[PDB]
Design a protein around this ligand. Sequence first.
Ligand SMILES: *[C@@H]1O[C@H](CO)[C@@H](O[C@@H]2O[C@H](CO)[C@@H](O[C@@H]3O[C@H](CO)[C@@H](O)[C@H](O)[C@@H]3O)[C@H](O)[C@H]2NC(C)=O)[C@H](O)[C@H]1NC(C)=O
Ligand SMILES: *[C@@H]1O[C@H](CO)[C@@H](O[C@@H]2O[C@H](CO)[C@@H](O[C@@H]3O[C@H](CO)[C@@H](O)[C@H](O)[C@@H]3O)[C@H](O)[C@H]2NC(C)=O)[C@H](O)[C@H]1NC(C)=O
Ligand SMILES: *[C@@H]1O[C@H](CO)[C@@H](O[C@@H]2O[C@H](CO)[C@@H](O[C@@H]3O[C@H](CO)[C@@H](O)[C@H](O)[C@@H]3O)[C@H](O)[C@H]2NC(C)=O)[C@H](O)[C@H]1NC(C)=O
Ligand SMILES: *[C@@H]1O[C@H](CO)[C@@H](O[C@@H]2O[C@H](CO)[C@@H](O[C@@H]3O[C@H](CO)[C@@H](O)[C@H](O)[C@@H]3O)[C@H](O)[C@H]2NC(C)=O)[C@H](O)[C@H]1NC(C)=O
Ligand SMILES: *[C@@H]1O[C@H](CO)[C@@H](O[C@@H]2O[C@H](CO)[C@@H](O[C@@H]3O[C@H](CO)[C@@H](O)[C@H](O)[C@@H]3O)[C@H](O)[C@H]2NC(C)=O)[C@H](O)[C@H]1NC(C)=O
Ligand SMILES: *[C@@H]1O[C@H](CO)[C@@H](O[C@@H]2O[C@H](CO)[C@@H](O[C@@H]3O[C@H](CO)[C@@H](O)[C@H](O)[C@@H]3O)[C@H](O)[C@H]2NC(C)=O)[C@H](O)[C@H]1NC(C)=O
Ligand SMILES: *[C@@H]1O[C@H](CO)[C@@H](O[C@@H]2O[C@H](CO)[C@@H](O[C@@H]3O[C@H](CO)[C@@H](O)[C@H](O)[C@@H]3O)[C@H](O)[C@H]2NC(C)=O)[C@H](O)[C@H]1NC(C)=O
Ligand SMILES: *[C@@H]1O[C@H](CO)[C@@H](O[C@@H]2O[C@H](CO)[C@@H](O[C@@H]3O[C@H](CO)[C@@H](O)[C@H](O)[C@@H]3O)[C@H](O)[C@H]2NC(C)=O)[C@H](O)[C@H]1NC(C)=O
Ligand SMILES: *[C@@H]1O[C@H](CO)[C@@H](O[C@@H]2O[C@H](CO)[C@@H](O[C@@H]3O[C@H](CO)[C@@H](O)[C@H](O)[C@@H]3O)[C@H](O)[C@H]2NC(C)=O)[C@H](O)[C@H]1NC(C)=O
Ligand SMILES: *[C@@H]1O[C@H](CO)[C@@H](O[C@@H]2O[C@H](CO)[C@@H](O)[C@H](O)[C@H]2NC(C)=O)[C@H](O)[C@H]1NC(C)=O
Ligand SMILES: *[C@@H]1O[C@H](CO)[C@@H](O[C@@H]2O[C@H](CO)[C@@H](O)[C@H](O)[C@H]2NC(C)=O)[C@H](O)[C@H]1NC(C)=O
Ligand SMILES: *[C@@H]1O[C@H](CO)[C@@H](O[C@@H]2O[C@H](CO)[C@@H](O)[C@H](O)[C@H]2NC(C)=O)[C@H](O)[C@H]1NC(C)=O
Ligand SMILES: *[C@@H]1O[C@H](CO)[C@@H](O)[C@H](O)[C@H]1NC(C)=O
Ligand SMILES: *[C@@H]1O[C@H](CO)[C@@H](O)[C@H](O)[C@H]1NC(C)=O
Ligand SMILES: *[C@@H]1O[C@H](CO)[C@@H](O)[C@H](O)[C@H]1NC(C)=O
Ligand SMILES: *[C@@H]1O[C@H](CO)[C@@H](O)[C@H](O)[C@H]1NC(C)=O
Ligand SMILES: *[C@@H]1O[C@H](CO)[C@@H](O)[C@H](O)[C@H]1NC(C)=O
Lengths: 345, 345, 345, 166, 166, 166
Amino acid sequence: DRICTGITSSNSPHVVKTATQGEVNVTGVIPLTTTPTKSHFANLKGTETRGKLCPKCLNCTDLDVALGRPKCTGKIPSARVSILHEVRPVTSGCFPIMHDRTKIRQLPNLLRGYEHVRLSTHNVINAEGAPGGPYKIGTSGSCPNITNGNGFFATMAWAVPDKNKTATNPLTIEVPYVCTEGEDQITVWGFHSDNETQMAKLYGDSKPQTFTSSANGVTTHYVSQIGGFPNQTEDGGLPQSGRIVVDYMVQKSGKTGTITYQRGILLPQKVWCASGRSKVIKGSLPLIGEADCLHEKYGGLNKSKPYYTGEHAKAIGNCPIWVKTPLKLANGTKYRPPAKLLKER
Amino acid sequence: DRICTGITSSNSPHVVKTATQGEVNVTGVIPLTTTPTKSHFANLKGTETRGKLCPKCLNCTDLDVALGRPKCTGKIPSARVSILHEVRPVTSGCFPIMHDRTKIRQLPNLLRGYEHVRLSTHNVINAEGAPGGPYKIGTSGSCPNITNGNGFFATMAWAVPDKNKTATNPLTIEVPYVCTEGEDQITVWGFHSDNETQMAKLYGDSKPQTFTSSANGVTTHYVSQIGGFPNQTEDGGLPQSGRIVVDYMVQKSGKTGTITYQRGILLPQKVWCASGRSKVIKGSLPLIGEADCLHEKYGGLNKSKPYYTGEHAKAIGNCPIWVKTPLKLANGTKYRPPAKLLKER
Amino acid sequence: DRICTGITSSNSPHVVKTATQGEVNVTGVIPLTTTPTKSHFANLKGTETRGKLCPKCLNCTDLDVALGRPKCTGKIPSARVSILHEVRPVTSGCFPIMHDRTKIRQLPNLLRGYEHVRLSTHNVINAEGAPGGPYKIGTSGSCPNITNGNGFFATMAWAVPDKNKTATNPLTIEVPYVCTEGEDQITVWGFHSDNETQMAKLYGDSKPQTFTSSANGVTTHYVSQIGGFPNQTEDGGLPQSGRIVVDYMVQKSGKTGTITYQRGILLPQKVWCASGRSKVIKGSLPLIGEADCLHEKYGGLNKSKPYYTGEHAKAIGNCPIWVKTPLKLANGTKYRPPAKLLKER
Amino acid sequence: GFFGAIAGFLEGGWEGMIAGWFGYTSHGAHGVAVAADLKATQEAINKITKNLNSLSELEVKNLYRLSYAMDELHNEILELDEKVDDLRADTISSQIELAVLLSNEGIINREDWFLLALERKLKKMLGPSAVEIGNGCFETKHKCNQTCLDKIAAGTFDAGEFSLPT
Amino acid sequence: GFFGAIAGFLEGGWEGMIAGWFGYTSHGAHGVAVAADLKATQEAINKITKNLNSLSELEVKNLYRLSYAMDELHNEILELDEKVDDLRADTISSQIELAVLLSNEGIINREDWFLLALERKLKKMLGPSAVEIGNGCFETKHKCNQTCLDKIAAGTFDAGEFSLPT
Amino acid sequence: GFFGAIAGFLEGGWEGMIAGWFGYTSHGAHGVAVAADLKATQEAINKITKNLNSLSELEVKNLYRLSYAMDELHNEILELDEKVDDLRADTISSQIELAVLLSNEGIINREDWFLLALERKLKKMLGPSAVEIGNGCFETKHKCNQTCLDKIAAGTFDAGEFSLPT
Ligand SMILES: *[C@@H]1O[C@H](CO)[C@@H](O[C@@H]2O[C@H](CO)[C@@H](O[C@@H]3O[C@H](CO)[C@@H](O)[C@H](O)[C@@H]3O)[C@H](O)[C@H]2NC(C)=O)[C@H](O)[C@H]1NC(C)=O
Ligand SMILES: *[C@@H]1O[C@H](CO)[C@@H](O[C@@H]2O[C@H](CO)[C@@H](O[C@@H]3O[C@H](CO)[C@@H](O)[C@H](O)[C@@H]3O)[C@H](O)[C@H]2NC(C)=O)[C@H](O)[C@H]1NC(C)=O
Ligand SMILES: *[C@@H]1O[C@H](CO)[C@@H](O[C@@H]2O[C@H](CO)[C@@H](O[C@@H]3O[C@H](CO)[C@@H](O)[C@H](O)[C@@H]3O)[C@H](O)[C@H]2NC(C)=O)[C@H](O)[C@H]1NC(C)=O
Ligand SMILES: *[C@@H]1O[C@H](CO)[C@@H](O[C@@H]2O[C@H](CO)[C@@H](O[C@@H]3O[C@H](CO)[C@@H](O)[C@H](O)[C@@H]3O)[C@H](O)[C@H]2NC(C)=O)[C@H](O)[C@H]1NC(C)=O
Ligand SMILES: *[C@@H]1O[C@H](CO)[C@@H](O[C@@H]2O[C@H](CO)[C@@H](O[C@@H]3O[C@H](CO)[C@@H](O)[C@H](O)[C@@H]3O)[C@H](O)[C@H]2NC(C)=O)[C@H](O)[C@H]1NC(C)=O
Ligand SMILES: *[C@@H]1O[C@H](CO)[C@@H](O[C@@H]2O[C@H](CO)[C@@H](O[C@@H]3O[C@H](CO)[C@@H](O)[C@H](O)[C@@H]3O)[C@H](O)[C@H]2NC(C)=O)[C@H](O)[C@H]1NC(C)=O
Ligand SMILES: *[C@@H]1O[C@H](CO)[C@@H](O[C@@H]2O[C@H](CO)[C@@H](O[C@@H]3O[C@H](CO)[C@@H](O)[C@H](O)[C@@H]3O)[C@H](O)[C@H]2NC(C)=O)[C@H](O)[C@H]1NC(C)=O
Ligand SMILES: *[C@@H]1O[C@H](CO)[C@@H](O[C@@H]2O[C@H](CO)[C@@H](O[C@@H]3O[C@H](CO)[C@@H](O)[C@H](O)[C@@H]3O)[C@H](O)[C@H]2NC(C)=O)[C@H](O)[C@H]1NC(C)=O
Ligand SMILES: *[C@@H]1O[C@H](CO)[C@@H](O[C@@H]2O[C@H](CO)[C@@H](O[C@@H]3O[C@H](CO)[C@@H](O)[C@H](O)[C@@H]3O)[C@H](O)[C@H]2NC(C)=O)[C@H](O)[C@H]1NC(C)=O
Ligand SMILES: *[C@@H]1O[C@H](CO)[C@@H](O[C@@H]2O[C@H](CO)[C@@H](O)[C@H](O)[C@H]2NC(C)=O)[C@H](O)[C@H]1NC(C)=O
Ligand SMILES: *[C@@H]1O[C@H](CO)[C@@H](O[C@@H]2O[C@H](CO)[C@@H](O)[C@H](O)[C@H]2NC(C)=O)[C@H](O)[C@H]1NC(C)=O
Ligand SMILES: *[C@@H]1O[C@H](CO)[C@@H](O[C@@H]2O[C@H](CO)[C@@H](O)[C@H](O)[C@H]2NC(C)=O)[C@H](O)[C@H]1NC(C)=O
Ligand SMILES: *[C@@H]1O[C@H](CO)[C@@H](O)[C@H](O)[C@H]1NC(C)=O
Ligand SMILES: *[C@@H]1O[C@H](CO)[C@@H](O)[C@H](O)[C@H]1NC(C)=O
Ligand SMILES: *[C@@H]1O[C@H](CO)[C@@H](O)[C@H](O)[C@H]1NC(C)=O
Ligand SMILES: *[C@@H]1O[C@H](CO)[C@@H](O)[C@H](O)[C@H]1NC(C)=O
Ligand SMILES: *[C@@H]1O[C@H](CO)[C@@H](O)[C@H](O)[C@H]1NC(C)=O
């Protein structure tokens, strides 16, 4: 007799790629990729995840909370992961704003990149005694407070001259640093303007006014407009005749800021003290359920295979790795012609 | 007798590098690199390639076309690859400009990063009825049109007061969005200034004027100069006594812009509507021939070897890959001492 | 008898990681990593290393030398590696400055990124004949020179009106390019302000003044303050009543700059001509000794092992490579059960 | 592989092997008989499993948004950030494809060493009187039917019962 | 390699081999005779060619200019962009050098497996009566001149014509 | 390895080997005797040393500060620069771990080829009359005590002195 060693022969419908033989047919494989399917966004498994800034504040948007609208004040919980669910945030509240003449729409999104965010407990300057005369603090009917009747944003003070209604030269305030040592300070200020008759009635001058700010080498300059405003959007719905322009400046730890102003200033009162860092990707709300990974194109994912094929995007968590092609690991033997019967002659 | 297996012995002048034996001598090799030679620039093989912006406009530079000079208007063909052949573009045309007080020289290069670029078909604002009084539109003798005699740039309107020659406070226009939804809008504006006598004759005031622009959070401020200008360069050659300062602002889709101005404004008329994306590298003109790859140091290349050694730079197309050293793949057998005669005793 | 081949058996306390067997026990290893220890900073071995800008200038800080303080002038040696030892540089010298209203504190650090830095030999403009009237050049008692008695910074000229003490409109100077062709030009300018009485005595106007600068598309705007200044810090110790605000602008080769000003200008005299490039990391002084590598967390290192584990940071020189885990190379044989006596039965 | 092309191995295989990849076949007067080896198949499977574990246990760092850069105010920085993400994905994908190519290369090459091991296990267990030809086949002096190969592939074959020296 | 250093192979080679890299040589009373094997040489060449194809078929993404960043207004962004290009070129160059080092390592190591394959092909074709020594050489009972080795290396040698058992 | 699991090798080793990793052992009436081979150990050590030199001779580019970006005025650019450094360190670390994994894989696999080399060196030097079993062991017709193995492992054993054909 003749006893020999050999190798099986079977159906070999799979193809793999080697480095010295080219592409070969193999009996079986192990896939290493999937193409996922679009789903909704979830809570990250093991970490606290931020959606809205204050979720216990009802009937508030994120810009409402960032600007300090009355009845939208609350404690902001910490989080190590955030969702950016709104690329151009809106108000629904207080006095009407001309949102598009500054960069204020992006203030909530900035605030969501820090882990700890809080509103100071004291005012940064005393408004009634600031340069430019004794002031009285103005309130608006389109801004009611907890016992209804008149209010304003908690981050600013509308300073109207008390006794002397006259024009002025530019005035300068130095905005101090009131947070603790590792924290950044975000200061919110702005100005108000109206039509000619009301400008002469409130302030004593009916010409455009000039405003300047400076912090950490960054400088900004504005000029106001008298009359002929666009229409009111995203506000309380009462008719008005004037508008406000709002801005913010960042003070890195230890540093002081400067504002130069004329008639119509909204002086800063409460500042945001912010420290730490958070991880942000774009998503949508509500967050339903729990998942291993969050992906910008696919939502929540659970990791099964080590790799994936599809659209590459940003992701946070326990995620697979992106590859160009579907990859396979051989789990068989190379193709073997059914040459039993050839040798069996 | 004795029959043995063996291996040849030959001249082994080549050296390759292994991981467990060091460097060895081998009979033959396969090179994998070349050092290319500097050549001219060509057309990319398989793609439409942009040189000049409007190549059917004769006697025009790129900044002439970008500013809308008369007889330099034409249709701008689309392209997915562009050549940046001029790091500081020049004019040769219309009214003289003080090019170095703004960022306008870079407007053509910006326009060449978009795939589709066109000039709107209607004016963005009505110039004669803008704030600041009824206006009349000024023309220049150094800017003749198709039937010669007087013209101006098509992107701007020189607004001179019609009846009342008086000073003014700052005025504000809101520049609207007139392109379709996926497109960016580039707005071109500026101002004119002269010596004292002519400033009092044209506008009614002989002091410096202040101009401001704002779009998408970006703000800019200018002050004009009365008399004592530098010399005229890159213009039609007629003597003048005043100069213009030109700038542009970008409006991302949906957004509105703002200009604040005084006497001497050149108001925007035609805006650039631009969408898509193009791939840019630095090169030179003319484009002669066709090639697989375009390289910033070597020009047009045809791919022969997978790698190259030389100066690394940016490249577009079907290109080899850069490596530090010349690489070789062994195509022989290791060095074998000619020990025939040693065993042949 | 029976003669067999075999493999030794020993203590196998080391563990290495393979790709098809998992983790195995091995007789011996070769380590490839270390965790270094914090040390002081040294001189790079083979290269000239910069600490202070002028180390032969005694009792000077780096900002003193950058601003041109009297008796702090000297030749600045070239170097291909620099140490950034001060994240907010201080003065100790001349007239008091309000350092925090501009970006001037960072001027020394900018200057330390160039290989060649020198101060021009002629003044860039003639100060007494500049626009705004005939001027006389002011000196300060808190700024004595080599034969004591009165001086000022060598990069600026304090221009006070000679005969006519009146208010003015904005004036414009064009700052020319005086360095050679491959070099960048850094221009230093500023302005002085005081309380109301002294402003009316020195200049003839007691209102805030406006200053603007423009170079290479970058624009900046300032407004001055009358009275109520903060306290003097980092100066010569004499009592004063006014303060200066200082800034710089960069002109890339060939380009011209522009300044617009009013009463109180400190016009530029000597400019910094700078070319080349240097390598910078953060460290501390003094430099003691010599080392192969400089590391931002560990100081000077000598290379023993190819890799290291610890905190990753920037480094310059002949340095090891960072890896996540301690790595080992097997230098033994796999674990072998002491089965002598098992077969020895 | 390149080893069996020269050494003279058989280029085809048997479909009587259903319980394994590698095995034995005996050709004689009665015809052909086939049996499968279980231990060789098992350790080939084990090595492929350890290789899969090695491939599945590598980590790279997450890519998410920059904290300080805002839309429409920092467009240049955000374009460079997108380019950085593109390039990093490209590099890691190329590295993973290289690792899988090396893995499949090794898996396909082991098919001749798994067969040399079988050949000389068979030589040891088949007794001193057998003769090696050179291409994995052996010539015996005794009949070997299906139960014979069943005992051979199971590691219980003893030539003593066949009245031949061992 | 490390295999022939211990197994006792010859450290030198023959220049009578002009038509191949690997081959046979017979030493006897008449002196020496040399012949070359063509199939082994051919498949070694084929494997090196497939390896070259594998090395030549990898792609990386193009590096070109940023669309929105302008000269002298965005110098900081453009310096960072240049640094990104430098680092990416460095990383891909290091990876390519690693792949070529592995390729050359494999090509130089195969020289002893190509020779074991030849040794046992020769043993199979040389007949049952030959004796293996251990270092690739064989002792025969018959004369083998140049035409003998010509028929051996061509795969047509039959010991039956030599009046010896096969 | 996977080769000795099937070929029938011994799963244990000897601690009489103090002067090497690989060696010989003779089992007979007198009991056991052990000796160590020096050349095999030496070239295994040499190959590990060349591998260490290959691992230790790769360079990457330095990472230092950008020359034009200043603190607190260019914070967005500096955050992106820090991210670039993080990503580059991660990529190069992953590549180095892959190279070390391949090195250790090769070092652990060579342990069976170093032993096949020893087996057939022993077969060549032990004389034509010995019989190979199949798992590296050999049967001789003569006594072999410690001095016998001392001469065998030193490469001076000659069977002529043992009154047996060579
Ligand atoms: C090795 O692997 C390849 C890749 O899977 C196998 O090729 C495949 O073979 C089947 C059978 O012929 C092809 O099916 C097709 O059926 C249609 C009718 O539905 C017929 O018109 C086609 O001509 C073809 O027969 C299948 O398309 C084909 N796949 C590819 C990508 O070409 C191959 O059979 C395997 N085995 C061998 C020995 O090559
Ligand atoms: C500038 O804005 C102010 C905003 O108050 C405009 O004043 C308002 O003008 C309307 C015009 O009719 C006044 O309505 C009047 O209300 C009184 C009291 O209810 C009523 O007796 C009249 O018959 C009429 O309905 C309104 O009171 C008045 N508000 C004020 C003065 O506070 C003003 O018209 C605007 N100016 C221009 C030029 O647009
Ligand atoms: C990814 O994996 C997570 C974790 O398993 C999945 O969340 C799981 O979803 C199931 C089904 O909705 C829930 O568990 C079960 O819910 C039923 C609801 O009646 C409850 O009666 C069972 O006792 C059990 O709790 C739950 O939401 C959650 N499981 C756990 C243990 O937390 C998720 O659906 C997976 N997919 C994605 C895309 O995230
Ligand atoms: C292995 O490869 C190396 C690298 O090519 C070979 O080294 C080379 O050998 C030649 C012959 O000696 C050298 O030529 C030179 O000629 C000049 C006269 O023109 C003489 O002065 C030199 O002393 C030398 O002989 C050549 O420079 C040399 N290359 C290098 C880089 O050193 C080597 O011959 C090859 N073979 C062996 C067995 O090493
Ligand atoms: C400010 O710029 C204006 C630019 O027009 C200067 O006005 C021009 O001044 C020249 C000086 O001679 C005038 O030339 C005259 O032309 C008339 C008509 O051809 C001729 O009769 C005279 O003999 C002389 O050649 C020119 O007409 C005049 N252009 C005007 C008024 O439109 C003006 O001088 C500049 N002012 C300063 C202070 O530099
Ligand atoms: C890279 O490869 C391209 C493609 O082959 C080269 O362009 C080729 O250049 C030849 C020679 O100038 C031209 O083809 C021939 O031109 C003659 C001119 O008389 C014509 O009579 C022939 O019939 C033929 O068309 C042509 O420009 C072009 N060939 C093709 C088929 O398009 C190029 O020169 C190579 N090198 C570089 C650096 O690009
Ligand atoms: C293979 O390598 C591993 C890794 O070093 C060895 O494991 C180690 O074995 C020793 C001896 O048992 C362990 O020592 C410990 O001693 C304490 C008392 O101080 C005792 O309570 C522990 O239970 C243990 O015996 C050592 O912790 C252990 N290392 C690890 C990481 O588990 C192993 O011995 C080596 N050899 C074999 C055959 O596995
Ligand atoms: C604005 O700043 C100037 C800075 O000089 C202040 O002027 C200084 O005011 C003090 C106040 O007493 C003067 O001191 C006097 O000195 C003279 C001469 O030594 C002495 O006779 C007096 O008894 C008194 O000590 C000082 O001379 C004066 N310096 C001057 C005028 O150059 C001024 O007070 C400040 N204004 C305000 C409103 O703060
Ligand atoms: C890294 O390596 C350098 C280079 O060796 C080390 O610097 C060496 O430090 C030694 C000890 O301080 C010095 O060399 C000796 O100094 C004594 C001082 O009395 C002198 O008498 C000897 O003749 C000898 O010069 C020297 O500073 C320096 N050696 C040389 C040759 O330059 C350094 O300490 C090592 N470590 C670090 C963290 O840099
Ligand atoms: C809510 O808003 C009302 C607006 O009237 C506030 O009531 C006035 O508050 C001021 C501030 O102390 C008092 O001087 C007035 O006497 C209050 N009554 C009036 C104007 O009728 C009320 O204090 C606010 N409640 C808050 C802020 O908690
Ligand atoms: C070319 O420029 C000439 C400049 O005179 C234009 O001619 C005048 O155009 C205006 C605009 O409608 C008319 O009001 C005048 O009556 C024209 N004739 C004059 C001033 O003599 C001419 O229209 C321009 N051609 C174009 C723009 O196609
Ligand atoms: C050092 O400073 C003193 C300050 O008095 C300078 O002395 C005056 O210099 C000016 C400039 O030429 C002369 O017009 C005066 O006549 C000098 N004497 C006075 C005012 O008493 C001196 O020149 C400076 N030395 C330098 C700059 O080297
Ligand atoms: C939120 O808004 C709804 C809609 O008007 C209202 O009914 C509800 O009372 C509001 N809740 C609070 C807490 O203000
Ligand atoms: C503002 O409101 C009026 C009133 O309906 C409307 O006619 C006008 O179009 C609105 N303006 C804009 C810009 O929509
Ligand atoms: C272009 O300029 C040349 C040079 O003067 C001139 O001869 C030619 O007519 C011009 N062509 C057009 C179309 O303007
Ligand atoms: C301007 O032109 C005049 C006339 O030739 C010349 O003297 C002067 O130098 C020119 N100015 C410059 C800056 O070249
Ligand atoms: C300035 O100096 C005075 C005098 O001691 C001191 O009272 C005051 O607190 C100082 N100002 C600051 C901001 O420290």
